[PDB]
Amino acid sequence: DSTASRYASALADVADVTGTLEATNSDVEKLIRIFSEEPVYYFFANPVISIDNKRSVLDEIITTSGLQPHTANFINILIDSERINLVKEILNEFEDVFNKITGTEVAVVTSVVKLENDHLAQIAKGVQKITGAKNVRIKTVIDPSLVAGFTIRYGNEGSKLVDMSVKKQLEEIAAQLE
Amino acid sequence: IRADEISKIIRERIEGYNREVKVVNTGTVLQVGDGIARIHGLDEVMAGELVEFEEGTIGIALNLESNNVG
Amino acid sequence: IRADEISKIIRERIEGYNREVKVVNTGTVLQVGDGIARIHGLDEVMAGELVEFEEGTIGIALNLESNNVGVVLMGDGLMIQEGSSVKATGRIAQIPVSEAYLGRVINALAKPIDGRGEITASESRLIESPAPGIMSRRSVYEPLQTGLIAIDAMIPVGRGQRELIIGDRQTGKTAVATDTILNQQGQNVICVYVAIGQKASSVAQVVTNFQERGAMEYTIVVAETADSPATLQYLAPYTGAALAEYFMYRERHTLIIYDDLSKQAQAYRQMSLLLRRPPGREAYPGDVFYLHSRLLERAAKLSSLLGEGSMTALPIVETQAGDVSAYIPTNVISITDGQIFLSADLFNAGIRPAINVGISVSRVGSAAQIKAMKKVAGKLKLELAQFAELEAFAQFASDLDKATQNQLARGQRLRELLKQPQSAPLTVEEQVMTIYTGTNGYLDSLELDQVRKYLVELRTYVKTNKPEFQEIISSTKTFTEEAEALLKEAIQEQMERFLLQ
Amino acid sequence: YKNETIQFEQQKAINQVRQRVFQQALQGALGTLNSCLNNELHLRTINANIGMFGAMNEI
Amino acid sequence: LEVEAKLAEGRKKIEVELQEALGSLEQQKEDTIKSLDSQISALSDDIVKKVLP
Amino acid sequence: KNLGRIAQIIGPVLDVAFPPGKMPNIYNALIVKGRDTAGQPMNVTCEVQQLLGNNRVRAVAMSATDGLTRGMEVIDTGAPLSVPVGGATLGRIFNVLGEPVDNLGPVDTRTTSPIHRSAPAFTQLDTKLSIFETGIKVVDLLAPYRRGGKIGLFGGAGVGKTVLIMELINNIAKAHGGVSVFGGVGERTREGNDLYMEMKESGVINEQNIAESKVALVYGQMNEPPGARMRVGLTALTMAEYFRDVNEQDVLLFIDNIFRFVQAGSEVSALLGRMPSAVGYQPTLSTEMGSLQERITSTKEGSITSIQAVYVPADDLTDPAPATTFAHLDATTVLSRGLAAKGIYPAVDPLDSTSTMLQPRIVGEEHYEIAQRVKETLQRYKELQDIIAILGLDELSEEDRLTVARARKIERFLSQPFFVAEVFTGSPGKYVGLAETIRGFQLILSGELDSLPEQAFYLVGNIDEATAKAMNLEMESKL
Amino acid sequence: KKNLGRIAQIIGPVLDVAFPPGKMPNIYNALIVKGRDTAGQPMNVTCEVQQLLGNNRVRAVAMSATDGLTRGMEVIDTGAPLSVPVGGATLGRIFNVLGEPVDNLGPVDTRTTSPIHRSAPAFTQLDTKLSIFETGIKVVDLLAPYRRGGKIGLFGGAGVGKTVLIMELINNIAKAHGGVSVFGGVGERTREGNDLYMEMKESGVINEQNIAESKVALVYGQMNEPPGARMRVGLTALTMAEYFRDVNEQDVLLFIDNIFRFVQAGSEVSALLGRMPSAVGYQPTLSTEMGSLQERITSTKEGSITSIQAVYVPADDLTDPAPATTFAHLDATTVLSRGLAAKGIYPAVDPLDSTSTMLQPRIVGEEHYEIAQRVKETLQRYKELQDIIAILGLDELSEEDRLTVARARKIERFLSQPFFVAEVFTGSPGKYVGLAETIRGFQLILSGELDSLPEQAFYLVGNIDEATAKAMNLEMES
Ligand SMILES: Nc1ncnc2c1ncn2[C@@H]1O[C@H](COP(=O)(O)OP(=O)(O)OP(=O)(O)O)[C@@H](O)[C@H]1O
Ligand SMILES: Nc1ncnc2c1ncn2[C@@H]1O[C@H](COP(=O)(O)OP(=O)(O)OP(=O)(O)O)[C@@H](O)[C@H]1O
Ligand SMILES: Nc1ncnc2c1ncn2[C@@H]1O[C@H](COP(=O)(O)OP(=O)(O)O)[C@@H](O)[C@H]1O
């Protein structure tokens, strides 16, 4: 319930009531793509440089990159209310707030081997059963330290997490010495 | 941490910024409890101007911070 | 014997393991600084769950926000990488319990720090098991013995009653605690000397004295190194409380010695401060009241419906410069069953123990002490209070009234009865003997400074000549005319023996 | 008490030998991980993940 | 003084006996723990079979 | 819905969130339920004080913080908490939320008054002033209560206040045929238990058959959260309120301690995002005492007489909670560590303790002269005593040397034993009549019984018994 | 070798360093910073981590003067906790907060080094014997016996002869018993540090040549030092001491003075760490840090680390927490009341609170126990009469109480131990006393053998026979 989280919530809520849901989604994707470079991020983050020049630059980038007027108006409010210093975590949490309001449950299931995509859909259906979420945005990455087992991680960010790779060995080496 | 960090007023804000003006007519609560309340709006409010509350339980305002009047 | 048989037990522990479907809450640790771990993620974590790190220095989750969770480091985690998968344990700070603890120096994570070997234990006692119920419990109607004279004389302790020792430093608080522990040698009393936040050399000294006195066969010392993390240093009294609950819940009445509790408040203060939970007054967090409330209210007397045992408590709190208006000795006096003081003046002035009953008080009274001492000297507490005032009044000693002269020399000799040597725990029947010797004015005519010698002569004389007295009264708890007769008889005899000479 | 300290050391040494045997178990497990094929043991991992997925839906 | 010094001497002798018995037990335990490395390989293989399904 | 999440839990403060469809009002009972450590259907009740924006609210819980975990459901009852009140709600001991904690049969929960309510305006307050005698010597002499008033036990560090309440309840619960109620508010639980045992003993609970019990006990633990303790007084007050308006009988309240309630309010207010105040407390102390001491008022509809224990920490008066509690009291009894140290009980310095009902015309203009003479010689002695402690009584001049011994007898004479305190004293107490009191004091202050030894006045109920003990003391001066 | 990178923030003493996101260093480990200077970019900036603070950033404590460095300096993670030279390399060498020899001698051999801090020693690795040795200062030897291997607390305010009492104690036990004698100076007046260093050089317990024959390891930390340095020198000195008690397996004499300055450095660094304050001003963690510095002192199964710690009681406030932790944490409290020094006794030690658990009959002999008793009862009674005798004069007492006041002031001036090192300060070449004195001066005072010689006739003389000879001299001069 941070400031970045609640500003993200305001943006996702105006997108949800205005029907600009996925438009603002792709828009914040390209927006954080633009904020990836620290020159322009520092240009906005510096409070020394003049606010009218900053506003002109923002509206300029808005017109050029062809963005939603909602996120345009939003980041104008952000530079006005000075919280443009925080846009990194603002948008980085806004994607997840959008995922929340769209119910899409991002679940990073790492493992040691690139699992069969049917089994990805299988555990996707299983975790949608255990969650009730709209989507389960299945995410995978090869982890070598994980020995063999499936290693899910779901919930809000990384809260709920099941493994079978080293956790099996951890079970054995824990419970043996007791 | 900021004042009026409530995202409902900010939803209204990002809907209807597109002007350079105020909100001076009336306002809404932002925060309330223990007989005090931090409220939004009615920007011209005199120092100690009485406040016509909802449910008529009127009060006087002494904190009048930027986005939030107490 | 090693590596020659244990392979089959290795197979037994391996084969038949869980391979569970345990979905767990797991947190990526964000902000560890100075004994705390403000951890990112970790949503469904019960406040009070132990949280397993990379390390093994587990931690209790005390506070929790919308983003972070205030988690402490029971065991200081000296190396924890940021973003480490710090999952909870699910269970809530449970404590294993057995009668095989009876002697092992045990750490707050239930761990034997005795060197005696690990303990098998079955139950999982909660760390916040609440107080016993209001209707469920009986009044403290039964005596529990001090071994020290003046406390059982005026300000009685009772089984289930939670008297509070208090006083300045270096005035024998831990000493009178251990004395009233190893008083309990045949009273079926478990003692739990929970040592908190002091010298491990001191706790080694007290377990040395316990090994001398044999009392470490049944007592359980929860040590707390001063280097132990302050989360552990405040946690340990809750562990001792639940461990004594383990024995009181069967039938077995017990006693506990927190030692001290002021360091518990200080360590808990440190944890709450690093947790940024804001301080109340005197820079403490406000709810040290609540902490000690939950502690001491877990110490009471059972009734017959659930086991009629007791958990009489002795939480020593430390007060600097003889104050009472220090914040923790202001909370604990409201939440204790009366308080006893050890003034530095009374200790260094020979009254050892130093319980000046002018400020000392036991707020359940005679119903928690024996009927014999009741019928003898219920009144002696207030008599000695008047003697204390009048002896302060007898500073103006020019022409004292003859009656107040009798009263002052009387209470003088009474106060001299309340002198006792170092670690000489008198029989409670002997306390009845000396209390009747005082209350019946035999010593009034006698020598005023040789009353200690009169008493040791008298107690040897009765313990030899008429030991039937102490057993008949200990079987009846009642000061009868037989007790009177044997008493005054040996009184005439030993009064003769010490008059000549 | 000193006699009991000997049995304390005995149980501690039994646990220490058990810990060294668990280190040897970690060694043999790493050897089996090396001799756990990137396709065969991967297929075993996928099948075990599918069975664990059925267990998860049951959970 | 007599009984106290006698018991102190007896306690010193018993402490010597405890030190000797403890050294003997610890040396025998370390010897037997270094011993029997084959059961370690066998139990490691059994753990491999338990973990790998 | 109204189902929300609990975003932050820090101590017994619970930051509950809610969807923007519903954000409930203040003071409303919220109940997270169905969860515990054992998978139990354990519920926790939590009421709301501050609602911190974004449709979220920080609440205080009336049961322990353990059990419930952030991101959990919560069912607000759409209403402020309501306490089961009625004559069926006598006898049994019950919770702050009203659940019978006597562990036998629950009372019939059908008439539940809301726990937070309006305070009676003074147009409803019974302005009828009245006099009360309660049989305890120093009180019914010098701090005579109003049968209708508010009665304060300004106690020190656990000295004579609770035993005073036990004695006084024992003496007046039978006396007042109307309803009575003890409110155990943060009381020490084993001494509330001892009180409950004494009510079982003296049959005021009538343990074999209840709801004829004109006494009604409600208790809240020390070990309970301060969220419980900061409303248990409101629970007891509402039970008395129901009996004062609906039943509109003579109602008797004995809450202990009010400062427990104050400390619990301070305790949660530090947590629930609010500043501190002057030493001790919350900045809402005055309004807390306002709610209480405006709701405990003898009404023109129905009388009430609430006594209440006030433990001051550090045993003083400049402390802010007694600095407003005196301002909200009318029958003040202030105990003293000094008079407890000299064993004199109740250890009230009569200097500090006064009452509005000590007017001469309303106590009897000779009783008032008794009271004035005792207060005069007593205060002069309490002045003189340090000069004594440096220059000797025998030096300290005769026209005051008589008065020092006189008032020195006076205070110990008005130390009188209690029928329960005999466990602490040795002799069973006495229920003293005020005529006997003023008679004995008209002997002492005049200087008729200046022949008696002073300790003949020690711990004696009546002055004729003091003469009897005096003859016994003289007899033993011979023997 | 480990993570290189950049300091992102420096805030006076404290510093916040960012790092590669992969591996942050340990907590409590050290790391140097290269940084810059005027001439050369020396590794003078040693540093030590305190709090990993988000965003792959660690908030860390400095050890030296920390101007001239900036954000973005080339920080070097050394990974390990702060190592420090140990061994015979210590012996005699006056080395500094990180172990480097600042005695203008050779850089000591790093072949044996040890980390700065470690775990607490074990419940079993505590000793058992209540060890007692005397010193030669009679008030101590009367009523505050010294748990050797335990902790010996020196309390008092400022300007009350506490450092001077430590100089006298080390002046005795430097050539008295005990093996290696590790003095540490936590926040010492550095001119006085080199002063007693020169006293070691002149007294020869330390060695000019062949310095590895010293049994003395004077690792001072001067008062001038930055708060990290003052915060760490205690851990350095105790690392030396535990090194010797585990490797020399020696009874180590552990003069340290004064650890209040250490915990004040802790308070000062916490105030920039942003940890919320505590009682009256200090760090919230004073309890645990004093617990560290105490519990890592023990008398081992073989090394009785006798520690003689001073605590600067600030403004003579006993209820301050910086005392209130320590004299729970130690054995022999010795508070030095300033008003006694105002009267003019040196040392200025009350009997009432200056105490020990060594004062037990079954340790000191019941005879010496009751000796100390019969002193203490009388002097406590004298205080109880003092606070009402000062008002309203002398003779309003009894004959008994008048005689008791006389005899109590007899013991009082009788405990005026003339100090052997204080000759250069006052003029009197001090005296040495022992257990025959400890019994006999008490015995003559309490029996009433010496009962007519005036209050000057046992003033500033240790030996009671010396008091008799002084009485003879002053009676002769009339
Ligand atoms: N009856 C007694 N006779 C003589 N000495 C006593 C008696 N009771 C206690 N003492 C002494 O009190 C001294 C201090 O003991 P203790 O440590 O319990 O005091 P304390 O105030 O608890 O100190 P701390 O709080 O630092 O532990 C001991 O040396 C002990 O000898
Ligand atoms: N025992 C003593 N003998 C002679 N002179 C003394 C003694 N104690 C104090 N003085 C005088 O008082 C001055 C300062 O007192 P003192 O040296 O005791 O404080 P200190 O030792 O510096 O205290 P600390 O070391 O705790 O800071 C000394 O310079 C000396 O002149
Ligand atoms: N002179 C006295 N008369 C009666 N009780 C006394 C006296 N002195 C001390 N007490 C004790 O004080 C206790 C009552 O203290 P009180 O303030 O009433 O309750 P609490 O201590 O719980 O606040 C009694 O239990 C009794 O043992």
Q: What's the CA angle centered on C326, arms C322 and C332, to 5 degrees?
A: 100
With beta carbons less than 8 A apart as the criterion, state whether F309 and F160 touch. Answer: no
Name the phi and psi angles at A171, rounded to 5: -50, -55
- Give yes or no for D19 touching E (CB within 8 A): no
- The span from the CA of C300 to the CA of C162, in Å, is 7
- Domain at F81-357, CATH homologous superfamily: P-loop containing nucleotide triphosphate hydrolases (3.40.50.300)
Q: Which of C11, C250, C363, C452 is catalytic?
A: C363
Nearest CA to ligand 2 atom 14: G159
Find the residues whose C-beta lies inside 6 A of ligand 1.
Answer: C 169-176, 318, 352-353, 422; G 328, 357, 359-360
Q: Using DSSP, how many helices (H) and how many strands (E) does chain E show?
A: 2, 0
Query: Could you tell me which of F51, F71, F83, F54 has the C-alpha nearest to residue F4?
Result: F71
Fold of the domain spanning G1-81:
Thrombin, subunit H (2.40.10)
Instruction: Kindly determine whether residue E36 and residue C17, on different chains, have CB atoms separated by under 8 Å.
Output: no
Q: Considering CB atoms only, which of E30, E32, E48 is closest to D28?
A: E48
Taking the Cβ of residue G125 and every Cβ of chain C, the question of whether any pair is shorter than 8 Å is answered with no
- The structure tokens listed for C125 are 């006692």
Ligand that lies nearest to the alpha carbon of residue G169, given by its number in the listed order: 2
Q: C-chain residues within 8 Å CB-CB of G127? A: 201, 204
Per the annotation, does G160 bind a ligand? Answer: yes
Domain boundaries defined on chain F: 1-80, 81-357, 358-477
Q: A174 near A133, Cβ under 8 Å?
A: no
CA-nearest of G469, G458, G379, G368 to G416 is G458
Helix (H/G/I), strand (E/B), else coil: F295:
helix
* Range list of β-strands (E), C138-253: 164-167, 190-195
Q: Is-contact G164 G425, C-beta < 8 A?
A: yes
CA of F445 to the centre of ligand 3 (A): 29
Judging contacts by C-beta atoms under 8 Å, the chain B residues touching residue A83 are 2
D46/A177 CB distance under 8 A: no
Atom nearest to C148 CA in ligand 1: 1
Angstrom distance (rounded) from CA F99 to CA F106: 7
Q: Hey, what are G246's tokens?
A: 């585990």
Contact G273 C34 (CB under 8 A): yes
CA of C404 to the centre of ligand 2 (A): 51
> G313 vs chain F: nearest CA distance in angstroms?
26
Please tell me what resolution, in angstroms, this structure has: 4.5
Q: Is the dihedral of CA B14, B20, B24, B30 positive or negative?
A: positive
- Find the F178 Cα to ligand 3 centroid distance in Å: 29
Nearest CA to ligand 2 atom 28: G161
3-state secondary structure (DSSP) of residue C369? coil
Give the one of D7, D14, D52 whose C-beta lies nearest to C2's C-beta. D14
Instruction: Write the DSSP symbol of residue F449.
Output: G
Annotated binding residue G339: no
Q: Which amino acid is at C1?
A: I
Listed by number, the residues of chain D in 3-42 with a beta carbon closer than 8 Å to a beta carbon of chain A are 15, 18-19, 22, 25-26, 29, 33, 36, 38, 41-42
Q: Is F161 one of the annotated binding-site residues? A: yes
Nearest-Cα distance to chain A for B57, in Å, is: 30
The encoded tokens of residue C105 equal: 């120096």
Closest listed residue to residue A151, CA positions, set F463, C372, D53: D53
Which atom number of ligand 2 is nearest to the Cα of residue G157? 26
Give the determination technique.
cryo-EM
Question: What does the H/E/C string look like for chain B?
Answer: CCCCCCCCHHHHHHHCCCCCCCCCCCCCEEEEECCEEEECCCCCCCCCCEECCHHHCCEECCCECCCCEC
Tell which atom from ligand 3 comes closest to the C-alpha of F257: 23
| C210 contact partners, CB below 8 Å, separation of at least 6 | C178, C181, C182, C216, C219, C221
CA C9, CA A110: separation in Å to the nearest integer? 35
Active site members of G? 162, 188-189
Tell me whether residues D56 and A122 touch, CB distance under 8 A. no
- State chain D's maximal CA–CA distance in angstroms: 58
Phi, psi of G434, rounded to the nearest 5 degrees = -145, -150
> Measured from the CB, is residue G338 less than 6 Å from ligand 2?
no
Phi, psi torsion values for G4, nearest 5 degrees: -85, 170
Q: Any CB–CB contact under 8 A between D33 and chain C?
A: no
> CA gyration radius for chain A?
21
Q: Which residues of C are annotated as a binding site for ATP?
A: 167-174
Least Cα separation, residue F17 to chain A (angstroms): 10
Residues G229 and G63: beta-carbon distance below 8 Å: yes
Q: Do chains D and B touch (3 or more CB pairs under 8 A)?
A: no
Residue A175, helix vs strand vs coil: helix
- Structural domain boundaries in chain A: 1-103, 104-178
What DSSP line would sit under F111-137, residue for residue?
-EEESS-PPPPTTTB------B--S-H
**F158 Cα–ligand 3 center, Å:** 6
Contact flag for E and F (3+ C-beta pairs < 8 Å) = no
Tokens describing residue B57: 């339980």
Asked whether the beta carbons of residue F223 and residue C294 sit closer than 8 angstroms, the reply is: yes
Q: What is the CA radius of gyration of chain D?
A: 20
F461 marked as part of a ligand binding site = no
From the DSSP assignment, how many helices (H) and strands (E) are in chain D? Answer: 2, 0
CA of C354 to the centre of ligand 1 (A): 10
Report CA dihedral (G456, G457, G459, G461) to the nearest 10 degrees. 160
Rounded CA separation F338/F345 (Å): 11
Owner of token pair 């001036």: G413
The tokens for F76 are: 């607000």
For the domain G82-358, what is the CATH code?
3.40.50.300
The protein residue with its alpha carbon nearest to ligand 1, atom 14, reads C172
In which element (H, E) is residue F83 found?
Answer: strand F82-84
Neighbours of F314 (CB within 10 A): 17
Which CATH number is G359-478's, of 3.90.1480.20, 2.160.10.10, 1.10.1140.10, 3.40.140.10?
A: 1.10.1140.10
Binding residue numbers of C: 167-174
CA distance F7 to chain A (A): 8
DSSP state, residue G319: T
Tokens, residue C417: 């009865």
Sign, CA dihedral B15-B18-B23-B26, equals: negative
Give the C-alpha distances (Å, rounded to integers) separating F286 from C171, F262, F323, G278: 42, 10, 10, 28
Is the Cα torsion angle C218, C224, C225, C229 positive or negative in sign? positive
- b (16+ CB within 10 A) / e for B18-29: eeeeeeeeebeb
Determine the Cα angle at D4 with ends D2 and D6, to 5°: 75
Q: Would you state the CATH architecture of domain F358-477?
A: Orthogonal Bundle (1.10)
Q: Are strands G45-52 and G30-33 parallel, antiparallel or unpaired?
A: antiparallel
What structural domains does chain B harbor?
Answer: 22-70 (2.40.30.20)
Domain over F1-80 is classified CATH 2.60.120.1600 = no
The residue in chain C having the minimum alpha-carbon distance to the alpha carbon of residue F100 is C135
The DSSP bridge pattern shows strands A107-108 and A138-139 to be parallel
Using CA atoms, how far apart are residues G259 and D39, in angstroms rounded to an integer? 64
Cβ atoms of B70 and B36 closer than 8 Å:
yes
| Buried-state track F131-152, b at ≥16 Cβ within 10 A, e below 16 | bbbbbbbbbbbbbbbbbbbbbb
D3 to chain E: which residues are within 8 Å by CB?
21
Question: If you count them, how many residues does chain C have?
Answer: 501
Q: DSSP class of residue C100?
A: G
**Chain F interface includes A160 (CB < 8 A):** no
CB under 6 Å to ligand 3: residues?
C 361, 363, 365; F 155, 158-164, 188, 191, 340, 343, 345, 421, 424
The alpha-carbon gap from G425 to the nearest alpha carbon of chain C, in Å, equals 34
G288 at the C interface (CB within 8 A)? yes
Tokens of A138: 């299945």
The helix (run of H) or strand (run of E) holding residue C258 is strand C254-259
Please tell me the residue having the least CA distance from ligand 3 atom 20: F158
